[PDB]
Design an enzyme around this catalytic site. Sequence first.
Site, PDB file in Angstrom:
ATOM      1  N   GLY A  19      -5.168   1.553   5.921  1.00  0.00           N
ATOM      2  CA  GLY A  19      -5.615   1.448   4.536  1.00  0.00           C
ATOM      3  C   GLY A  19      -6.233   0.112   4.213  1.00  0.00           C
ATOM      4  O   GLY A  19      -5.945  -0.884   4.886  1.00  0.00           O
ATOM      5  N   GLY A  20      -7.046   0.094   3.161  1.00  0.00           N
ATOM      6  CA  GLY A  20      -7.668  -1.119   2.640  1.00  0.00           C
ATOM      7  C   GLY A  20      -6.633  -2.099   2.116  1.00  0.00           C
ATOM      8  O   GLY A  20      -6.802  -3.331   2.262  1.00  0.00           O
ATOM      9  N   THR A  56      -6.902   9.230   7.115  1.00  0.00           N
ATOM     10  CA  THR A  56      -7.710   9.495   5.911  1.00  0.00           C
ATOM     11  C   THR A  56      -9.071   8.804   5.906  1.00  0.00           C
ATOM     12  O   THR A  56      -9.899   9.104   5.038  1.00  0.00           O
ATOM     13  CB  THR A  56      -6.916   9.188   4.620  1.00  0.00           C
ATOM     14  OG1 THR A  56      -6.011   8.079   4.831  1.00  0.00           O
ATOM     15  CG2 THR A  56      -6.198  10.431   4.078  1.00  0.00           C
ATOM     16  N   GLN A  96       5.835   4.207   0.392  1.00  0.00           N
ATOM     17  CA  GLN A  96       6.498   5.470   0.699  1.00  0.00           C
ATOM     18  C   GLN A  96       7.594   5.327   1.758  1.00  0.00           C
ATOM     19  O   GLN A  96       8.664   5.914   1.589  1.00  0.00           O
ATOM     20  CB  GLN A  96       5.498   6.590   0.961  1.00  0.00           C
ATOM     21  CG  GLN A  96       4.766   6.973  -0.326  1.00  0.00           C
ATOM     22  CD  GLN A  96       3.828   8.169  -0.230  1.00  0.00           C
ATOM     23  OE1 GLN A  96       3.273   8.496   0.836  1.00  0.00           O
ATOM     24  NE2 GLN A  96       3.585   8.815  -1.381  1.00  0.00           N
ATOM     25  N   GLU A 134     -10.522   3.262   9.855  1.00  0.00           N
ATOM     26  CA  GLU A 134      -9.173   2.804  10.230  1.00  0.00           C
ATOM     27  C   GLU A 134      -9.129   1.896  11.464  1.00  0.00           C
ATOM     28  O   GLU A 134      -8.430   0.885  11.380  1.00  0.00           O
ATOM     29  CB  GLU A 134      -8.152   3.951  10.303  1.00  0.00           C
ATOM     30  CG  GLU A 134      -7.781   4.456   8.916  1.00  0.00           C
ATOM     31  CD  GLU A 134      -6.610   5.407   8.762  1.00  0.00           C
ATOM     32  OE1 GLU A 134      -6.583   6.135   7.743  1.00  0.00           O
ATOM     33  OE2 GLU A 134      -5.725   5.436   9.650  1.00  0.00           O
ATOM     34  N   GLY A 158       0.796  -1.226   0.000  1.00  0.00           N
ATOM     35  CA  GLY A 158       0.000   0.000   0.000  1.00  0.00           C
ATOM     36  C   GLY A 158       0.825   1.269   0.000  1.00  0.00           C
ATOM     37  O   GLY A 158       2.054   1.203  -0.120  1.00  0.00           O
ATOM     38  N   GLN A 159       0.162   2.433   0.150  1.00  0.00           N
ATOM     39  CA  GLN A 159       0.853   3.722   0.114  1.00  0.00           C
ATOM     40  C   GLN A 159       1.917   3.908   1.217  1.00  0.00           C
ATOM     41  O   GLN A 159       3.053   4.277   0.920  1.00  0.00           O
ATOM     42  CB  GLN A 159      -0.143   4.886   0.102  1.00  0.00           C
ATOM     43  CG  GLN A 159       0.539   6.251   0.038  1.00  0.00           C
ATOM     44  CD  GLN A 159      -0.421   7.382   0.181  1.00  0.00           C
ATOM     45  OE1 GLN A 159      -0.467   8.038   1.225  1.00  0.00           O
ATOM     46  NE2 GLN A 159      -1.207   7.637  -0.864  1.00  0.00           N
ATOM     47  N   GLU A 175      17.576 -14.140  16.082  1.00  0.00           N
ATOM     48  CA  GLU A 175      18.033 -13.568  17.343  1.00  0.00           C
ATOM     49  C   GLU A 175      17.055 -12.532  17.880  1.00  0.00           C
ATOM     50  O   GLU A 175      16.903 -12.423  19.097  1.00  0.00           O
ATOM     51  CB  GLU A 175      19.412 -12.941  17.171  1.00  0.00           C
ATOM     52  CG  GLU A 175      20.543 -13.742  17.799  1.00  0.00           C
ATOM     53  CD  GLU A 175      21.961 -13.244  17.544  1.00  0.00           C
ATOM     54  OE1 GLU A 175      22.301 -12.965  16.372  1.00  0.00           O
ATOM     55  OE2 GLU A 175      22.749 -13.172  18.514  1.00  0.00           O
ATOM     56  N   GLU A 182      -3.616   0.296  -6.455  1.00  0.00           N
ATOM     57  CA  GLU A 182      -3.748   1.497  -7.302  1.00  0.00           C
ATOM     58  C   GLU A 182      -2.325   1.789  -7.860  1.00  0.00           C
ATOM     59  O   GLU A 182      -1.360   1.528  -7.148  1.00  0.00           O
ATOM     60  CB  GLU A 182      -4.250   2.673  -6.430  1.00  0.00           C
ATOM     61  CG  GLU A 182      -3.960   4.089  -6.911  1.00  0.00           C
ATOM     62  CD  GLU A 182      -3.510   5.044  -5.822  1.00  0.00           C
ATOM     63  OE1 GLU A 182      -2.388   4.871  -5.296  1.00  0.00           O
ATOM     64  OE2 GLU A 182      -4.278   5.974  -5.494  1.00  0.00           O
TER      65      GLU A 182
HETATM   66  N1  LIG Z   1       3.970   7.216   8.204  1.00  0.00           N
HETATM   67  C1  LIG Z   1       3.183   7.177   7.087  1.00  0.00           C
HETATM   68  N2  LIG Z   1       1.905   6.874   7.150  1.00  0.00           N
HETATM   69  C2  LIG Z   1       1.172   6.804   6.043  1.00  0.00           C
HETATM   70  C3  LIG Z   1       1.710   7.135   4.748  1.00  0.00           C
HETATM   71  N3  LIG Z   1       0.678   7.026   3.850  1.00  0.00           N
HETATM   72  C4  LIG Z   1      -0.388   6.645   4.478  1.00  0.00           C
HETATM   73  N4  LIG Z   1      -0.116   6.505   5.830  1.00  0.00           N
HETATM   74  C5  LIG Z   1      -1.026   6.155   6.871  1.00  0.00           C
HETATM   75  O1  LIG Z   1      -1.595   4.898   6.467  1.00  0.00           O
HETATM   76  C6  LIG Z   1      -3.070   4.976   6.642  1.00  0.00           C
HETATM   77  C7  LIG Z   1      -3.777   5.082   5.272  1.00  0.00           C
HETATM   78  O2  LIG Z   1      -3.538   3.819   4.709  1.00  0.00           O
HETATM   79  P1  LIG Z   1      -2.726   3.777   3.292  1.00  0.00           P
HETATM   80  O3  LIG Z   1      -1.309   2.926   3.367  1.00  0.00           O
HETATM   81  O4  LIG Z   1      -2.435   5.111   2.696  1.00  0.00           O
HETATM   82  O5  LIG Z   1      -3.806   3.043   2.295  1.00  0.00           O
HETATM   83  P2  LIG Z   1      -3.454   1.834   1.316  1.00  0.00           P
HETATM   84  O6  LIG Z   1      -2.556   0.707   1.992  1.00  0.00           O
HETATM   85  O7  LIG Z   1      -2.834   2.299   0.090  1.00  0.00           O
HETATM   86  O8  LIG Z   1      -4.910   1.126   1.079  1.00  0.00           O
HETATM   87  P3  LIG Z   1      -6.021   1.717   0.037  1.00  0.00           P
HETATM   88  O9  LIG Z   1      -5.637   3.042  -0.467  1.00  0.00           O
HETATM   89  O10 LIG Z   1      -7.378   1.870   0.855  1.00  0.00           O
HETATM   90  O11 LIG Z   1      -6.178   0.699  -1.121  1.00  0.00           O
HETATM   91  C8  LIG Z   1      -3.370   6.280   7.450  1.00  0.00           C
HETATM   92  O12 LIG Z   1      -3.212   6.039   8.830  1.00  0.00           O
HETATM   93  C9  LIG Z   1      -2.217   7.166   6.956  1.00  0.00           C
HETATM   94  O13 LIG Z   1      -1.957   8.244   7.856  1.00  0.00           O
HETATM   95  C10 LIG Z   1       3.116   7.467   4.683  1.00  0.00           C
HETATM   96  O14 LIG Z   1       3.765   7.745   3.635  1.00  0.00           O
HETATM   97  N5  LIG Z   1       3.764   7.484   5.893  1.00  0.00           N
HETATM   98  N1  LIG Z   2      34.077 -14.816  29.775  1.00  0.00           N
HETATM   99  C1  LIG Z   2      33.507 -14.688  28.556  1.00  0.00           C
HETATM  100  N2  LIG Z   2      32.244 -15.050  28.392  1.00  0.00           N
HETATM  101  C2  LIG Z   2      31.639 -14.947  27.160  1.00  0.00           C
HETATM  102  C3  LIG Z   2      32.356 -14.427  26.049  1.00  0.00           C
HETATM  103  N3  LIG Z   2      31.512 -14.412  25.004  1.00  0.00           N
HETATM  104  C4  LIG Z   2      30.358 -14.883  25.369  1.00  0.00           C
HETATM  105  N4  LIG Z   2      30.377 -15.202  26.692  1.00  0.00           N
HETATM  106  C5  LIG Z   2      29.290 -15.807  27.462  1.00  0.00           C
HETATM  107  O1  LIG Z   2      28.753 -16.897  26.694  1.00  0.00           O
HETATM  108  C6  LIG Z   2      27.322 -16.843  26.582  1.00  0.00           C
HETATM  109  C7  LIG Z   2      26.928 -16.613  25.095  1.00  0.00           C
HETATM  110  O2  LIG Z   2      27.573 -17.673  24.310  1.00  0.00           O
HETATM  111  P1  LIG Z   2      27.911 -17.373  22.737  1.00  0.00           P
HETATM  112  O3  LIG Z   2      29.279 -18.106  22.305  1.00  0.00           O
HETATM  113  O4  LIG Z   2      28.126 -15.899  22.577  1.00  0.00           O
HETATM  114  O5  LIG Z   2      26.630 -17.864  21.820  1.00  0.00           O
HETATM  115  P2  LIG Z   2      26.956 -18.681  20.438  1.00  0.00           P
HETATM  116  O6  LIG Z   2      27.782 -20.000  20.774  1.00  0.00           O
HETATM  117  O7  LIG Z   2      27.834 -17.875  19.561  1.00  0.00           O
HETATM  118  O8  LIG Z   2      25.554 -19.183  19.752  1.00  0.00           O
HETATM  119  P3  LIG Z   2      24.941 -18.237  18.588  1.00  0.00           P
HETATM  120  O9  LIG Z   2      25.510 -16.729  18.635  1.00  0.00           O
HETATM  121  O10 LIG Z   2      23.494 -18.121  18.736  1.00  0.00           O
HETATM  122  O11 LIG Z   2      25.234 -18.840  17.121  1.00  0.00           O
HETATM  123  C8  LIG Z   2      26.887 -15.836  27.697  1.00  0.00           C
HETATM  124  O12 LIG Z   2      26.618 -16.552  28.930  1.00  0.00           O
HETATM  125  C9  LIG Z   2      28.125 -14.893  27.880  1.00  0.00           C
HETATM  126  O13 LIG Z   2      28.320 -14.503  29.256  1.00  0.00           O
HETATM  127  C10 LIG Z   2      33.710 -14.031  26.238  1.00  0.00           C
HETATM  128  O14 LIG Z   2      34.359 -13.571  25.307  1.00  0.00           O
HETATM  129  N5  LIG Z   2      34.244 -14.180  27.509  1.00  0.00           N
HETATM  130 MG   LIG Z   3      -3.867   3.419  -1.412  1.00  0.00          MG
END
Ligand SMILES: Nc1nc2c(ncn2[C@@H]2O[C@H](COP(=O)(O)OP(=O)(O)OP(=O)(O)O)[C@@H](O)[C@H]2O)c(=O)[nH]1
Ligand SMILES: Nc1nc2c(ncn2[C@@H]2O[C@H](COP(=O)(O)OP(=O)(O)OP(=O)(O)O)[C@@H](O)[C@H]2O)c(=O)[nH]1
Ligand SMILES: [Mg+2]
Lengths: 136, 432, 431, 435, 431
Positions: free
Chosen positions: E135-136, E171, E15, E175, E10-11, E246, E63
């Site tokens: 939006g829809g 709009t 955006q 909503e 959607g928009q 993670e 659209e």
């Molecule tokens: N932050 C942000 N909000 C937006 C933007 N455009 C729309 N919105 C918000 O999204 C809601 C309107 O839904 P939209 O995403 O514009 O509508 P749509 O997904 O295109 O769906 P339809 O037009 O009904 O087919 C309102 O709460 C808007 O204030 C944007 O660029 N930024």
């Molecule tokens: N003393 C010490 N403790 C460590 C260190 N790095 C991690 N730990 C400890 O080890 C734990 C996290 O183990 P990790 O080796 O970081 O996790 P991992 O084996 O990498 O597993 P994934 O990131 O999910 O793929 C926590 O209890 C930390 O306190 C280190 O450099 N020194």
């Molecule tokens: Mg739209």
Amino acid sequence: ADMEVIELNKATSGQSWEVILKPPSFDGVPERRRDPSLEEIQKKLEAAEERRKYQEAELLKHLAEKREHEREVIQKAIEENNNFIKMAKEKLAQKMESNKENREAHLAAMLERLQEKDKHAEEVRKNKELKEEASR
Amino acid sequence: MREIVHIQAGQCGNQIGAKFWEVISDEHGIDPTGSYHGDSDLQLERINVYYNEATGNKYVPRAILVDLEPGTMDSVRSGPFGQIFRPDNFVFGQSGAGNNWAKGHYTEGAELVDSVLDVVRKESESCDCLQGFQLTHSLGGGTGSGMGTLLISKIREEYPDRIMNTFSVMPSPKVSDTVVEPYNATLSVHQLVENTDETYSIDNEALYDICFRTLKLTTPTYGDLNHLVSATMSGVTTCLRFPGQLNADLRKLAVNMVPFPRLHFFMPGFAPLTSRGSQQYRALTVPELTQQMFDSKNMMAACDPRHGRYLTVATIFRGRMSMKEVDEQMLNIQNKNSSYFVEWIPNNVKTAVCDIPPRGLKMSSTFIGNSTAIQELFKRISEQFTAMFRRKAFLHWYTGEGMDEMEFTEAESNMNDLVSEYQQYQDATADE
Amino acid sequence: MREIVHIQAGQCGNQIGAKFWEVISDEHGIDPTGSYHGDSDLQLERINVYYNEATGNKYVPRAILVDLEPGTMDSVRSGPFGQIFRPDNFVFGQSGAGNNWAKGHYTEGAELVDSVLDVVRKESESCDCLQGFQLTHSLGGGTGSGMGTLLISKIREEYPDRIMNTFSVMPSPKVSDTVVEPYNATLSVHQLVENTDETYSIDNEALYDICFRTLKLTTPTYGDLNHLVSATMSGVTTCLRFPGQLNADLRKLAVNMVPFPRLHFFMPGFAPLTSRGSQQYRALTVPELTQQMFDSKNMMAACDPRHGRYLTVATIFRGRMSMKEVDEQMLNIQNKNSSYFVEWIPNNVKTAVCDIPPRGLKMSSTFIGNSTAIQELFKRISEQFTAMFRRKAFLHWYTGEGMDEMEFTEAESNMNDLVSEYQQYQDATAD
Amino acid sequence: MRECISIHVGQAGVQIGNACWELYCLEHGIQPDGQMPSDKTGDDSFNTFFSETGAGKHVPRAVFVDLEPTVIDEVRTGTYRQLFHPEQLITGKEDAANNYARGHYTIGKEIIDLVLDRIRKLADQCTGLQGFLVFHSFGGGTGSGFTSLLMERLSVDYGKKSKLEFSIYPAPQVSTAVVEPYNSILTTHTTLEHSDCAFMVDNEAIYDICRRNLDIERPTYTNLNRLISQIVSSITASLRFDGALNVDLTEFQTNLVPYPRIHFPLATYAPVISAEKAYHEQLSVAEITNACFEPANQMVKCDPRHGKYMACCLLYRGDVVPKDVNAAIATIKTKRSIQFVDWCPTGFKVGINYQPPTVVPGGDLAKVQRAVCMLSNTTAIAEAWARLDHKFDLMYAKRAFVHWYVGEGMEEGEFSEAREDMAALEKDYEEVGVD
Amino acid sequence: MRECISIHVGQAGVQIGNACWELYCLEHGIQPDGQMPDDSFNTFFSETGAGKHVPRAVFVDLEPTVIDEVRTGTYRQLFHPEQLITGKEDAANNYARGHYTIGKEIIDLVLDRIRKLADQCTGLQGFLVFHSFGGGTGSGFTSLLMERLSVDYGKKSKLEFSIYPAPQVSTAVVEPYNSILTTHTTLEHSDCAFMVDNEAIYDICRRNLDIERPTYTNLNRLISQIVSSITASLRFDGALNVDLTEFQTNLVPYPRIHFPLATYAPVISAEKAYHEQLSVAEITNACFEPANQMVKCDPRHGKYMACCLLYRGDVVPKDVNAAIATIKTKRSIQFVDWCPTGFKVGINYQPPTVVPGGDLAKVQRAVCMLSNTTAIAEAWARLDHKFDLMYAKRAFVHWYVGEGMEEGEFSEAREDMAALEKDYEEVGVDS
Ligand SMILES: Nc1nc2c(ncn2[C@@H]2O[C@H](COP(=O)(O)OP(=O)(O)OP(=O)(O)O)[C@@H](O)[C@H]2O)c(=O)[nH]1
Ligand SMILES: Nc1nc2c(ncn2[C@@H]2O[C@H](COP(=O)(O)OP(=O)(O)OP(=O)(O)O)[C@@H](O)[C@H]2O)c(=O)[nH]1
Ligand SMILES: [Mg+2]
Ligand SMILES: Nc1nc2c(ncn2[C@@H]2O[C@H](COP(=O)(O)OP(=O)(O)OP(=O)(O)O)[C@@H](O)[C@H]2O)c(=O)[nH]1
Ligand SMILES: Nc1nc2c(ncn2[C@@H]2O[C@H](COP(=O)(O)OP(=O)(O)OP(=O)(O)O)[C@@H](O)[C@H]2O)c(=O)[nH]1
Ligand SMILES: [Mg+2]
Ligand SMILES: [Mg+2]
Ligand SMILES: [Mg+2]
């Protein structure tokens, strides 16, 4: 003041003898298992080997049980994801069909209403035919 | 009993493992290129325990580097001694464990495991007489923890007659890198109780407390904690690394330290305690080194040894000192503190003296105790686990991987029995 | 959602429709020959909504001009922008409905209807994405009223998925002496309740009252009344005609304005109120626009909005002004007057600002409200209808065309239910 | 001719063997290459311990065994590498890891047939084989487990052929394993019926003699072994020279062993004097004999006052005369009890071996003109079994470390059997003492 | 190799995607033609044989208006035409049209394009879905897509960047309906959703960046900056990284409780210059202050169940641990008892990049905190209350029913929201 000396032996680099201070208070000298068998020894060594091996094979049996459980959790996760897909596919088709049915029914009801108006109109037109020309 | 095969798994495992390899290389006089440039024949006598001799003059660590994440692998190569490792010995996956034990143990880890066993079989088959394995890992993460314990189990199956030794780092809220650490630790402890012969319980709670309280470091980093680990690792491996009489090999050490199979969790100790930047220091006498054995402040596991009783103790003194003084001080410590040594294990304190001190200190002491006070470490994990499990918090991540709640309940129960067993021996009297 | 198909039926429908086409052509910079001579790319961005592009340069209104009387046709061609319309799009009968809804809906109108559908099918099928239809007509006459509602029904049958929008002009004794107007109006309202999505209730009573009371015109003509309609029509369609976020298309507008299907009768409002081709000098301030556009004196339907509650409101500001000022003034108006906005439809007032002001004013404001006070307009038609129906006055005009008394009774009942429904929502509490 | 085969098992057994054979070579004038200026013109008794080769080389009648190669590798690279033929130095790769069950049941099984084959080859070169001298530790897995396995087989292959031991009794000061009392009781039980005479060497007694008499602050195995060898030399001297007492191995059993199970004689040696000290007056025969009756000079820590003698042997070496010896024995009986059992005469069998005491040049010991070793079978030696049995009981009550033995195929029942046999031995010494 | 597929619906979704992809290109040094003179950016950009870098993204709208600006704009050469998908008619602010009526026409096409992007992935982590609740298209089409992605990719990670409605910029009156229906339908299909309240952003732009009347461009530039912080851990190799998995593991304690609160600091205007350089402690502290939140709610009256801190620029672990140590000592920052407290820290080398000519100041260090607090339930309660007010009267429901939806779907959706509200209440209690 008393000692009995009995010469035992004499040789090139030595001499030996017995010194007696007091004879034994009790006279008449003091107051066994064969052999063993190489086979008996072997039987016992072999029995110990079979124990070591039995327990090593037991430890392996439980590690193999851990391995089967591992394939089982992988399979559970696979099975749940397949069921998640199947649930989602059917809930979605049900939803898309119910909404098609409903949207078709609404458009049918509203077209029937407009067509009913059309029937009533030719009927209105027919009544004017009994009024127009069919007088004066 | 010559060769030891070393394995590094996960972030923690590789960080602590790298530090170990750089520390011992300096002790054996090996530069980052693998060449021996020392000036003592004592440095090479037992080099074959941790190093292989390659083409000519060069020495190569018998180390396997493992992770499900490619990052740490670059971090190691880039490190001080990074170029010393065998390039083929680096085994890394493409998608980390996401701090999930189930992913490391059953999913992603399981996919990488056979590639690791291939590198370890290559190193193992090259051995004249393989002692066993030494694994560095953390219990808090997903890889070191889950995959690490999967490895131990697969190694136990292929090499059942070998010694399985670990440097297992315990999690702490004080220096935590994931919310699910109590789960990953409890599931790992369960595996360690059943599948290792000897485990060095390296508690991050103890390391943090030493840095903050003793070293006066307001905000300790992993570097500060790893400086204590590397000291400890160097100290506990001294007897394996150099010629001596006591606990010269993994099996002999296990036979002296382990009275009951499940009670194989060691509380390591070290003196003097120093900070990375503490380049002072001019201190420590033999009575000063000995006093530290009962000093809870020098324990690498957050347990007070005075809260329990020692089943067995190995004490290693390093530097030039009187063995007479050492023996006298060690006997005095045992007679004065008889209440913290079980009476039913006679002469349960073994002492060794290595002439070579570690770099930085002229004199040092390492303590390896099998104390019933280690139950405090397990109670702390258990209480944390329970606080989460009671509410089934984060459980869907583990069950999502195909695990059942029953495995959680089993791991918890096993750990509670381990605690219960330590308590049983703590209470045992030599009434005989 | 680009193209809108416009239909003009009867005298009123064609006069108000002609005025709409000349007003919007000037706003988009289109001259009476159909050529674009403006000086802003904003005028052409959404030109495809009301115009087709033909032989190079030229723009042609997607308008269908209909009457049972040939007169108005000539009157349109002869008018300022008369030559802009597609010649084939003029569909005219020979008789005239004679202020009889039955003649327009069932007789002469029914005979001309297929010729009209011919031209509308052609315009509709040429569309890339047809929004729907916009019909201008009166409810008091016979063609705009009867044939107009017949058209809506026939077009709806062929295009059920499209939006049906009307500019429906309500009768008043003050402007027309035709005694049968309450009948024609009641019969038409009945059709509108069932077959349109959105209807702008343009009350000749309100138009007359504004001209007489506010503009100080002793004897107002259709020209005076139509000047207010064209202003309103330009204002309410601004959001469809220029790039914007709010009620940019007929469906989006309906979705924001219509909470209950039958309650789709809008009370339009406009500020500043002016007389024909008269200056000027001094343009309203934002608080002035905000206050004036919400006054009973500025309503194009003879209802006091303070007599009911708004279900929904669309407010359009035209001219160079601070959106900050506009937003602040719009919030103040709905906090100070909370009792005139239903509590059960949160944030029910939507505001838009178009940089392009209409010709004559530097600043303007258009109000589109769905107010329960519109029930006053329906009660007035209902009381007039009843005064006549009670005595069966002029019934033979309609029964002569084949209609039954039952249709009169049904239409009346439907309009009384509509009133009763508005009253129900006026009295509904959030709690 | 009466040849003796020496068998050295495990680290202790091998390292003591090194000290023994180094000393024998000095005593017989054999150089480390096995060359001996056989340029005599004599006593050919050394031939009971050294065979001769076609090169005029002298080779020890010995086998060195270890389940690991480290210690024996030092022998094959050391000063005496040419003294021994490679085939008589046997090693495995993995040790028994301080576990009796490992050395006996697991590893031992791999090298046993090899060791027996070498023993058979050495026995084939014997015209009148007397028997075997087995040197080992009670404490280590090899010294305990492999030794008991070997003793059992030697009884099968050489039925009713003498087997004597030089056993290292464990001391905490120098101990390497907490399980040493287990291995000690398991080996004692298994070897009991297979050994004819065992000479226990308590490591704490030796450690204390080195500390007290030799002013060695922290004694090393080299210090202990040089001392142990002096006593071993005193025991083996009449087998290796034309002596008169303990002339043959059979005579050890006859002279010192009244009952098969009570075969553990106590050894006492004098004098033990520091080399690095002031020139002193040479100790008389009286002074050295008196020292035989001093518990501080014993090879096993026990109190002979808390027992009874069943046999006594005094083995003198060097400048010694019968008149001085008899007068020395006479003065002792005056001032001391020296209680013998009812059924034994109160007396001494005395041997003088004119071959002077020999010391390792550059060692800790002072060369002396005269020395004496006393071999006495006393009921006081049971105190050493009691100390071991108590440590065993303390651990066994909790089943501490037992899983290590069970894991190797041993049964818990073996621990009970071994202990019951020790309980019987203890009861035997109590019963023999009675009257 | 660790790919992430971005989907923009959607928009709002489109955006924000424009703002995000513009910023990513500046961060990775990718020119608007997809050319560039690390390596991790490959998780978000695929490479062609010509050396061109193409976003791993799909843009969908019912659209063509909004996406037509992409195909004509500065970054027209950045995306292949096949990855920019448009229909002709929008869902007219109706969830039923987005999900069923209109959505059904383009769904297979969108899935085919995502299948093609997934085919170029050696290690797909999952999907990032950007849409509005209001939006829809943002509501209805997103729900449809989510359901379909769960069929085609099962449990593969799906994370949202959802725009929570604000009346200031709203709009459509409907909503709150579209918000509740989409939340109910997407709930079981989303792993982690990062809500962005438009009123919170509007107030940060007004109060912090001195913008009188903030536009979507202003809101979007700020939103994009937070999105970039969340995604930098995936697009760069910093001191400490965090992947899609993670995030799920550290922020989500229960499958339904998957809505973290985002807080960003610092937000400094392009003026002053003295307003820095803020320390790691100052920026961390700013994360627990309500004025910096992406959703309007009060954490002081709620409990934290998980915290993730994503630092960028000149930041050191020692500086960060020191800052967390003080957070751990604050009694006014309550954590649930069933939590070890839990702090997931990520650190990336690159300082926050600003769009040249934007409202934001260049900062040496910045941080985005993702916290799962029970206080976020206040935002559901506000939505649920507006829903209840209209639903009690069945206001606007006929629009949804007309498209084939049943009143039962409204009740189910609301009951599920009632359960979610109860879930946050239950999770907050101690055992
Ligand atoms: N932050 C942000 N909000 C937006 C933007 N455009 C729309 N919105 C918000 O999204 C809601 C309107 O839904 P939209 O995403 O514009 O509508 P749509 O997904 O295109 O769906 P339809 O037009 O009904 O087919 C309102 O709460 C808007 O204030 C944007 O660029 N930024
Ligand atoms: N003393 C010490 N403790 C460590 C260190 N790095 C991690 N730990 C400890 O080890 C734990 C996290 O183990 P990790 O080796 O970081 O996790 P991992 O084996 O990498 O597993 P994934 O990131 O999910 O793929 C926590 O209890 C930390 O306190 C280190 O450099 N020194
Ligand atoms: Mg739209
Ligand atoms: N505001 C306005 N009302 C008009 C106009 N022309 C006629 N009316 C009103 O509309 C009603 C009469 O509708 P007409 O358009 O003249 O009737 P018609 O649709 O042409 O049908 P017939 O003349 O019966 O063929 C009365 O209420 C008149 O007041 C006009 O230009 N402006
Ligand atoms: N006197 C003396 N005692 C020793 C020597 N070496 C070891 N011991 C003692 O013997 C016991 C240790 O047993 P060892 O002989 O070393 O072990 P082993 O026979 O080689 O058996 P394993 O090594 O377990 O396979 C301890 O009581 C040591 O103090 C030595 O050279 N001299
Ligand atoms: Mg990792
Ligand atoms: Mg007319
Ligand atoms: Mg040995």
